[PDB]
Design a protein around this ligand. Structure first.
Ligand SMILES: CCCCCCCCCCCCC/C=C/[C@H](O)[C@H](N)CO
Ligand SMILES: CCCCCCCCCCCCC/C=C/[C@H](O)[C@H](N)CO
Lengths: 253, 233, 175, 253, 253, 83, 56, 50
């Protein structure tokens, strides 16, 4: 039984698994050792696009604060202010019944760099490295983009390599949670601001990555196919924005 | 007249002794007959002086000092003179990569201790503490690493008497880091072992016959006692 | 299943009880292929000597209706590796009661003839074996999956320590 | 939720039914009012052969310390020392799901004497009265062994007579537990040493008997057949052995 | 006059020569700076095979705790527990009359390594390096095993080399006793646990060796031949066993 | 048996490791095929040992010691010796 | 070393009356000799031994 | 560059017979190693008269 109340939003659940605070520290404002503070106006839960969990699902990944670029006041402040700082509260919901099988692993990765799909090193463009609210998907094998004329310039994550050339089994080094359909249908993570600077640009740099992996295969009774919605709801915390200037409009396509 | 200052364990064992000689060559890689780098397994049983001194006791503890005395010479005298040589000695603990080529990744020394020596400098000296997995070094092991069990195949479970469990103390890889000289050069490094803070237990009788192998085996020379009359002074 | 996700799962079924082991491996974290690639194994690969106990955890990823009982045993060094539950139950063991706890942790005691163990494959410092067997069976009702996977995890205890830093054997460079 | 830790063994369960200490007394060493004490070396859990529960099952019976004759150090000490004394910790595991039906009755009987199958009184041999780790089975009716030439000389337990000419309903007089598949899938019993002597031979005399009876029929959903494994794990307690002598080798067959 | 009482065993003699405690220390249990302790059940005297002393006898050798592998509870614990530790009490009996001549030297050697009979170094097998209760014999000269097809893989001890390439005269450096037929017909030794580890395997490593050498020739009156029984009785002390596991069955032949 | 003195961050990272090799030549300037001077961009990613050790953590702070091990050799043996 | 400068003397063993044995007793009997250092024994000037050799 | 070895042989110690025999192992014989060009080697010995 868990209740997450923040700003003007509240999430109530009865199938939680307590929670883990990344590195043991909650988000806090910068100490002494003109700022803009939206406070509750921005510190609230926003629901991202719900994904489908199938037997063939390989995993999903989102970038923060990238996923919140279009979420109202938070995105507006990010595009209006040069520098910013904020922690995150992540909530993953995966409903299932007593006849379902499977398990999800939620990993909060600082500096989640993903391997590209092109021979040229780090040749992914900004528009493909910043999917937005829709995040992305993991692949079961590495595919090399040979389209020299029009390279895709997209990432090529590999599920068992975690998308960064590291065995998925070691991915538990990062702050993580396990949503087991037989014990809990949701999980929560608290991610404090992580960077080498007190404040940093909200458009050039991504602070966190959320990776959802199918630790166990999805199954239901004796049916040949089943689908489970997975919902990702994220709320910024201790919002701070600096360097007011003209609105920034990142390129698309 | 007693004093007994030079008869102590420290005085008896605190003496440098040559245990091995590592030979390396500076020559063109295309000559398969030349060894650009060498690897020597660390052990005191290649010699007889320090081995005999150590086998006086069954168990021992001590810190060690290693000294590397480097010498070099030419294989010809019609090619002028070569440039100053620089040698690299890398320690390979158990489980660490064994160099395969003279300039492979294993020489990066990311975490392997390494010593660099310039020809003409005073011989390199290093100190190492007690690195035995057990509580004391063992010079003899009345046992086997593997004990064959009933029902096992005849090709499995076999191990040599005594084997080596506590004796796996790493190896040393010696190479030349300078460019391959046009004229072949031959270098030899003598490794001198000097124990300190020596504590000993379970004294053993001195060896009587020549040493044959790391164990106690012998094949010949089993007649050390000379002839002398019973009633002859 | 090698070099994919499937290698991280161990399968279980609702078949009748059998003494055939479910899982088997050797307590050689720095040498065993299944443990050498874990964080414990990777850290140990940087050192020559290590000591201390370990925790092995198993998580059940089946359905709620699924229940059963499993045995996880540790055979100390110097004995023939367990081949059946009858030999497994002669040493330290734990009972995983799937239905009350979804996870089970077993602590491997530091039973050794030497102060420290080596991070290489050698019979001198054998760490024993770890085996997993059925106790009765996995029981599932109608309209429930009959193939369920379990996940294994390994971690170091508070007394774990390493020494004699050395280069690893899982690293290479061209030229 | 129960955890039984003894010697170098541990049993953890989450479907227990607390426990009952026979006669309200735990095993204890002999008080004053050269001994051999294996201590933890022998006081540990050993798993006996798992039996199958079917619709036609009539019950199972084991003898103690007979069932532990081959369980490592305990059996070795029993066969090496003339006299011995030890209590028992018995754990019965019977896994089942929410769709299963049935109930097991576990009875700890002191001096569990069973009726023979032959006309001659008490004519069962030692080799058949001491099955060992495999225990035995109950019959639904009394069958008389008429093989005069080669009598079987085995026991003939009857389920409704409890194997001793006593109605099974009264068997609850003994220390007992009930494993109901709808409330608990396992049970535990603590049996102190019971005898007219402080110590007694570990080969001539059996101290306890464990009887598992199908108090309710086994059923599963609407299936025509179902099988449930039943596991019996036993641990000696307060081991004491006396009278060291040459190893005893009981006859077989 | 000596009486050695240990466990359930007692040895009384009136022709002893006091005793020597090896290195001046009695066996003791491990100090702080689940264990199994058989106590008196294992700490008792066991008699090994009696050997014959003749004029041509060259000597005998036994290994410990190898010689006790089959001596009841001690061997059972050694084969059931991975690691172990125990001291030894050795008693050598050599009866003789006033008309007999000769002397025996009993040597307790730590890490008694013996030279092999094959050209290959340390090529003796486990089955030949662990004779058991029967020990072995010393040779008067070194014989090289040239049976390449089927090497014997046995030891080749030499009496005057002590079997390890060391003059027999220096063998007195080890804890030793002298049984002189004109002063004493028996001797006793107390050997504490000796090893580089607090505990060690009881099957892979041998802790002690007992060597009986004919320091003086055996003779009796003016007879042309005489034989003297020599008995070796050994008792473990401060038995400690650890790492309970499945029984170990060393290979034979 | 714990100690944990060699498992510290200092002990783990306080080890010399080769990161780059800079090659230079002493020859006549008129030979365009020879490099009289060399320039190397400072970075630890040219190797794999120290790179792997450092990538174990996302952020780090430390002081650095640089050691320059210099070796040289001739391209011929028929021209006596150089200074 | 063997030198007349530091001669240590000689040690000799003789009969005093005889060895006496009765009938049916061995007439050839062996004695064993042992040598040990006293509490005042000391050594100095450590040097290599003359009973050790190595090939090459 | 030449390297020289000077080994002390006290009374009763082995006399080297070959240039690379066992006697040069310096197991217990004091030895001094000199590299050409270095300052002349110097050692000190106390009173060693019997
Ligand atoms: C370039 C750096 C070189 C570093 C050298 C470190 C080597 C450490 C070796 C430790 C050897 C311990 C002393 C030997 C002990 C006994 O002799 C053996 N237990 C018996 O053979
Ligand atoms: C490589 C190490 C060399 C070590 C050299 C040690 C040599 C020690 C020699 C001691 C000589 C004592 C001084 C001589 C004394 C008087 O001159 C003589 N008694 C009279 O000839």
């Amino acid at each position: 039984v868990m209740q997450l109340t923040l700003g003007n939003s509240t999430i109530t659940t009865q199938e939680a698994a307590n929670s883990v605070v990344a590195y043991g520290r909650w988000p806090e404002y910068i100490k002494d050792s003109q700022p803009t503070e939206p406070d509750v106006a921005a510190c609230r839960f926003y629901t991202l696009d719900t994904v489908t969990w199938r037997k063939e699902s390989r995993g999903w990944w989102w970038k923060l604060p990238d996923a919140l670029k279009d979420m109202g006041l938070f995105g507006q402040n990010m595009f209006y202010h040069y520098l910013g700082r904020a922690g995150y509260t992540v909530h993953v919901q995966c409903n299932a019944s007593k006849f379902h099988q499977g398990a999800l692993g939620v990993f909060a990765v600082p500096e989640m760099c993903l391997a590209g799909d092109s021979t040229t090193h780090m040749f992914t463009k900004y528009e493909n490295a910043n999917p937005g609210e829709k995040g992305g998907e993991f692949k079961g094998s590495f595919t090399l983009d040979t389209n020299a004329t029009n390279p895709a310039r997209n990432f090529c994550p590999v599920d068992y390599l975690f998308g960064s050339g590291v065995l998925a089994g070691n991915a538990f080094v990062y702050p993580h949670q396990i949503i087991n359909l037989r014990t809990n249908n949701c999980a929560t993570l608290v991610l404090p601001y992580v960077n080498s600077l007190s404040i940093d640009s909200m458009t050039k740099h991504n602070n966190w990555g959320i990776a959802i992996l199918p630790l166990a295969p999805l199954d239901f009774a004796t049916e040949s196919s089943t689908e489970i919605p997975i919902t990702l709801t994220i709320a910024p915390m201790c919002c701070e924005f600096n360097g007011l200037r003209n609105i920034t409009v990142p390129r698309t396509q | 007249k007693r004093t007994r200052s030079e008869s102590t364990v420290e005085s008896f064992f605190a003496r440098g002794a040559c245990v091995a000689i590592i030979e390396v060559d500076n020559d063109a890689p295309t000559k398969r007959a030349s060894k650009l780098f060498s690897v020597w397994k660390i052990t005191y049983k290649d010699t007889v002086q320090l081995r005999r001194k150590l086998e006086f006791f069954t168990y021992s503890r001590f810190d060690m000092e290693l000294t590397f005395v480097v010498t070099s010479n030419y294989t010809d005298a019609n090619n002028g003179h070569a440039l100053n040589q620089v040698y690299q000695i890398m320690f390979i603990p158990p489980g660490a990569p064994i160099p395969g080529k003279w300039n492979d990744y294993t020489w990066q020394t990311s975490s392997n201790p390494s010593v660099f020596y310039t020809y003409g400098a005073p011989p390199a000296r290093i100190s190492v503490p007690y690195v035995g997995i057990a509580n004391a070094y063992s010079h003899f092991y009345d046992g086997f690493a593997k004990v064959p069990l009933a029902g096992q195949a005849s090709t499995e479970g076999d191990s040599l008497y005594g084997a080596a469990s506590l004796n796996d103390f790493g190896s040393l890889a010696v190479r030349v880091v300078n460019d391959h000289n046009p004229t072949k050069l031959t270098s030899k490094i003598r490794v001198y072992m000097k124990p300190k803070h020596v504590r000993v237990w379970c004294p053993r009788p001195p060896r009587a016959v020549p040493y044959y192998g790391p164990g106690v085996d012998y094949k010949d020379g089993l007649a050390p006692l000379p002839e002398k009359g019973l009633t002859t002074y | 299943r090698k070099n994919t996700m499937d290698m991280y799962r161990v399968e279980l079924n609702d078949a009748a009880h059998s003494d055939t082991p479910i899982l088997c491996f050797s307590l050689s974290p720095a040498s065993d292929p299944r443990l050498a690639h874990t964080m414990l194994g990777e850290i140990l690969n940087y050192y020559t000597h290590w000591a201390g106990s370990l925790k092995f955890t198993f998580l059940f990823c089946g359905s709620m209706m699924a229940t059963g009982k499993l045995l996880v045993s540790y055979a100390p060094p110097g004995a023939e590796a367990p081949k059946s539950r009858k030999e497994a139950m002669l040493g330290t063991h734990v009972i995983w009661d799937i239905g009350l706890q979804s996870s089970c942790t077993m602590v491997v005691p530091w039973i050794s003839n030497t102060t420290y163990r080596l991070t290489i494959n050698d019979s001198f410092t054998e760490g024993g074996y770890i085996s997993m067997f059925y106790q009765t069976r996995v029981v599932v009702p109608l309209s429930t999956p009959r193939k369920m996977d379990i996940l294994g995890f390994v971690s170091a205890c508070n007394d774990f320590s390493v020494r004699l830093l050395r280069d690893t054997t899982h690293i290479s460079q061209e030229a």
